[PDB]
């Protein structure tokens, strides 16, 4: 059997998509699913964890990456998330820096680094209607966000035109994505990207891909708008359809190639007439999409196959 090793917090691990998606890539009559333990990946060391052959392992909060990564060089696993870019995904100053450098639109953007210590002696100008990062003039509306890609507290400044204020988004508190402030000034504490506000049709397009040439697509309620998340009778956030085009689907193959990552999410603007990536998540899974499911275990099963077979002397035809 060829082993395949699941990796990540049991939050992820035993999440219901995690779930569908490894019970179907089980049905592979020559593939074994093993799901590390949270206590294991947690409390023993590398040399302990189980084997395996291919390896699906990813971030998200309280995971030792710095574990991850050090089996993946102890074992030497075919790696379908690159562990490394791991890293990068944290940071939103590093995703953005990843996407120019693969001629991806994206927001006009300014990176604000702030000295803890010093914090009044960085680079910002600001009025009433507009700031001024390293030189550079961003009039409301703008959006600033902490640089930890982890940090949710992304705002958007309105323009006196519009009564001023920001809104406050984080991540989803039961009913709410986000909150209006009168407060009209910018964060005075850390370190934020500030970048152009790309107008929309009022939803964002969440973009999931398995592997470069397949990727799924579904809109929601850009969180913005008022904050009331939108939810169903099962109390699941209502997402829209979507198709994208000939270009989106080059996008998500730049996406996936670049940050290595065969499983990646992202999120479009579709604004003016393009589409603009505004974040980059990496290892994500559709919920509540039957079709996603089956789908990404057959691509991912075709992946483990190809690459593997021969070295286990199976037969695999594409
Ligand atoms: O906090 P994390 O980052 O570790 O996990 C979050 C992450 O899930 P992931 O692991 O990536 O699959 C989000 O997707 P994402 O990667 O596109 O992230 P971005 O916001 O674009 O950065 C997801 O938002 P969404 O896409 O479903 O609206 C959010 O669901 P939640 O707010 O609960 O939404 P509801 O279930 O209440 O509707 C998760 O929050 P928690 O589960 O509470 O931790
Ligand atoms: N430049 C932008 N223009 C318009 N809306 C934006 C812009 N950047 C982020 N948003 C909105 O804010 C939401 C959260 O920002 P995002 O970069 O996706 O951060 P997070 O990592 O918290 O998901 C996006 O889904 C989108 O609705
Ligand atoms: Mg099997
Ligand atoms: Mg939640
Ligand atoms: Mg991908
Ligand atoms: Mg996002
Ligand atoms: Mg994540």
Request: glycine letters at 6%; hydrophobic letters at 35%; charged letters at 25%.
């Amino acid at each position: 059997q060829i082993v395949v090793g699941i990796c990540s917090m049991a939050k992820k691990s035993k999440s219901k998509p995690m779930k569908e998606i490894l019970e179907r890539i089980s049905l592979f009559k020559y593939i074994t699913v093993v799901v590390f333990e949270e206590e294991v990946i947690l409390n023993e060391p590398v040399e302990n964890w189980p084997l395996c052959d291919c390896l699906i392992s990813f971030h998200s909060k309280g995971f030792p990456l710095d574990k991850a990564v050090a089996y993946a060089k102890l074992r030497n696993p075919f790696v379908i998330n690159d562990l490394n870019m791991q890293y990068l995904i944290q940071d939103r100053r590093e995703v953005y820096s990843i996407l120019q450098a693969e001629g991806i639109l994206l927001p006009r953007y300014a990176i604000l680094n702030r000295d803890p210590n010093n914090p009044k002696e960085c680079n910002l100008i600001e009025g009433e209607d507009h700031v001024e990062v390293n030189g550079e003039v961003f009039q409301k509306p703008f959006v600033e966000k902490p640089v930890s890609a982890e940090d949710h507290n992304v705002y958007i400044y309105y323009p006196t035109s519009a009564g001023g204020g920001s809104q406050r988004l984080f991540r989803k508190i039961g009913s709410r994505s986000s909150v209006y402030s009168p407060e009209s000034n910018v964060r005075k504490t850390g370190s934020y990207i500030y970048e152009e506000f790309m107008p929309t049709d009022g939803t964002d397009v969440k973009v999931y891909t398995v592997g470069p040439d397949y990727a799924h697509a579904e809109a929601r309620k850009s969180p913005a708008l008022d904050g009331k998340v939108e939810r169903d009778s099962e109390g699941k956030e209502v997402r829209y359809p979507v198709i994208l085009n000939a270009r989106e689907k080059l996008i998500a193959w730049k996406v996936c190639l670049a940050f290595k990552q065969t499983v990646c999410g992202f999120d479009l603007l579709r604004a003016n007439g393009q589409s603009y990536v505004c974040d980059v998540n990496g290892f994500s899974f559709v919920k509540n999409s039957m079709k996603y499911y089956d789908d990404c275990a057959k691509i991912l099963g075709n992946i483990v196959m190809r690459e593997l077979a021969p070295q286990f002397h199976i037969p695999w035809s594409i």
